[model samples]
Target: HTSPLLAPVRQIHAFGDSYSDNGESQRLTREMLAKGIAGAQALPGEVYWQGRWSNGPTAVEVLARQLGAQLADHAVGGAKSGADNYYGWMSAYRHTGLAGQVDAYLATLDGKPVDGQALHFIFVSANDFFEHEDFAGEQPLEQLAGSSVANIRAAVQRLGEAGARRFLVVSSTDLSVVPAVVAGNRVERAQRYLQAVNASLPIQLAALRKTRGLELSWFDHLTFSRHLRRNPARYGLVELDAPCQPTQPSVRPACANPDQYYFWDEWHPTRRVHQLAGEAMAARYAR
Candidate 1:
């Protein structure tokens, strides 16, 4: 808003999960109508108000704010298209599908011309991991990996082929280090699988960049992941390995201030963590 602004405020569309839907819940309003939890803010003998999960803005919001852009978050908190929303969230639906998303997106922009200056960032596919773990039914990891990778590739390719040339393609971050690993009691196995998953990203991204004849660049988050896992203390983390939610007894809640920790829950990064990751992402383009 002051001086030395890079670009005028534009629209930044965010695509992702719970880390993107921080303030959409009506828990506060509902609580007010009910007896509500007691707290210092409520009365002397009132029970302490339990903090909900949707308190902070997502990393996408942080990025948009830094860039002075208006933002639109199409991400759902408990979404599980390809298998993201499965770590630890309430779910009454059979399964979430990506077909609706693909159709809607294509229909929305069908043939509309995009400004050469606009940016489109695609962040997805972590859900496929959960699908493979929980709802794949019979599909194994190898097949799941191939199918998920193909879907992501097609998405980026379609976007590039259309007028939307500028893109920020974000792949899944490190998942093994999250609280979910504790449930499985196999951190090393989860890490190995996640590493392979991340390794698959560059191959997909490079092929897309070359074939599309675009300037798309992939930022390898693998190293950043290693640092956080190995050196959480160095990063000033208070509860790096602790869980985020106290109520989820069966789940591992890692970290209290998710900003200090890299993950928000078992499968997604906290808003603070996403902010850090988003910073790393945006910084790559700075050079």
Candidate 2:
């Protein structure tokens, strides 16, 4: 049925938070994007690869390549759906939120419709559940999902209006498994917000499909991540015990067996993990 959705499109427009980011957000200008958005600042250059959060390309980037598509990634690291980031440097990308990230992409159109044959890949908004100035009193963790989903909905509609026809919306995984969450003991609350977003986004997508004549597919990052963790051996991955960064200060001493690890840092996945995810998704939708 959905086989009609499977195809090797030549171009893909990627928009999201860090999960899909390949350091495109940090590039100073549109032309500089060719160099990519490297995640490392200095020191252990080997800890991160190609200015990306992961040891190599992020999952979506890998997916685009697997499908033989050119990806125009516009995602910013540490970006929330629409909320402010917690860090100082990330402020530079404040205007490039979920919907806002599309602003730059929309401009190139100049009223011309987007490439109908291309795909719009989105993998973001997880940060919105945690990176916020207002919580509890103002915005409950449970209700934040509504606003997050609303922002994504708006972003997609913008692209649809611009003539995009195919899309793949990737959901956030269970934040409880993240090293940062475990360290802070924020697992329970973190999953609460995550659950809210997962529960709401699909319905919104269905509505969009009916209203916009759009072809939408959902990739459950949550379910996929959970399965990976539960069966690491099946994927030839050993225990994903630690991060490849913080401990690794330089490429002079690279992390051992980096492919076996799950996270490249506290937040991102290893090159192998990302590659596997990309492979899995590509197989899922491929003919």
Candidate 3:
């Protein structure tokens, strides 16, 4: 018998950053007929390949494909854990943030009850760490952690109110080890903040789950990322130290074997790594 956590999930409601995004901005914009939200004139295949930060389908897409489930993905690239007001940079792309994503998802419900077997996936917080210090004053790491948990809790509470029962919450990966981060001394600081956030999650989420009687699962993407970094060959990856593509925005690196590279760009993983991660996650909770 499979654990309930691994029960066959028939639908997915995903909200987070680019890692889980699958053209939500485009989809939402089209529904509202706001051409300027995600930029005017949807590309010919924009619906097929827009808003997804990865070179290919995100892990959420793969998971949905594997389960043959309908997916309502509301994640957007460059979203942070805090409110939109915290980062003036995202003001123009308001709906792209986590808070707005949750609001967008809630809008779709229209007071309808959530399907009992539907899986709600929330994987976020990378932008929060990356955009932690954008102003003159020093931002406390603890405050960042607090804001992250608060946003998560708020999303959970709202979903629960809408009848959501099963949740899969993914913590942020280890930012320090990313190719862009590894070359700098800031890795230690990022790692400390990541640990604090991860440590706080279980304690807080456990209480939330019990309070709501929701079936929940948590995945430590940080540890998984570290393991893949240390053992690239195990996942058929050849390079993890740097992006196959150069870091410069104007330069797009070409590769004969993109599968061998862990990172397709400075910030996002290659399609192959996403495939592997998706398979593992599906085997754990959706198979």
Regions of candidate 3 where Cα sits further than 4 Å from its true position: 1-5, 25-51, 85-93, 134-137
lDDT of each: 0.52, 0.73, 0.73
TM-score of each prediction:
0.71, 0.85, 0.86
**In candidate 2, how many Å is residue 66 off?**
1.3
Better of 1 and 2 by lDDT: 2
Worst ten-residue run, lDDT, model 3? Answer: 40-49
Q: Report the lDDT tens digits of candidate 1 across residue range 1-287.
A: 42332333366555444545433223322433364333202110111112213235566676676665676555544444443344332222212223333344556775776544555655655566655554534665555566766766676676567665666666565666666656666566456556655678668878778877765656455576666667767665555555554324443433445556554445545555556666666654331
lDDT of 2 at 177: 80
Q: Give candidate 2's TM-score.
A: 0.85
Tell me the lDDT of candidate 2: 0.73
Per residue, candidate 3 scores C-alpha lDDT tens digits across 1-287 of 86554677889988887677777545544543453443333311222335566668888888788777888887766677645533353466555677787776777777776787789988888778777643433668877777888888788878887888988888877787676566555688678778888999878888989999997788788877878888888878888766776544445545667789988766778788788777757777545
Q: What is the lDDT of residue 110 in candidate 2?
A: 88
